[PDB]
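User: Could you go from structure to sequence for me? I need the amino acid at each position, not a summary. Structure tokens:
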């Protein structure tokens, strides 16, 4: 239940670019780095930077 703080602008297709206010099921998350997120739709993955996301 996190929120996209900023509109992460990924350059590779791997990282899924999200928007401030999009749904993202955060997966792992150790130190402020680059945790991965999974959308609750088809089952895609996207390395979302922790600096661009935040718990509500």
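Assistant: Here is the amino acid at each position, in order:
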């Amino acid at each position: 239940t996190f929120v996209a703080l900023y509109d992460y602008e990924s350059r590779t297709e791997t990282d899924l670019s999200f928007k401030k206010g999009e749904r993202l099921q955060i997966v792992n998350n150790t130190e402020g780095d680059w945790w991965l997120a999974h959308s609750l739709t088809t089952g895609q993955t996207g390395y979302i930077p922790s600096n661009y996301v935040a718990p509500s």
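One structural detail worth keeping in mind: The longest strand covers residues 34-38.
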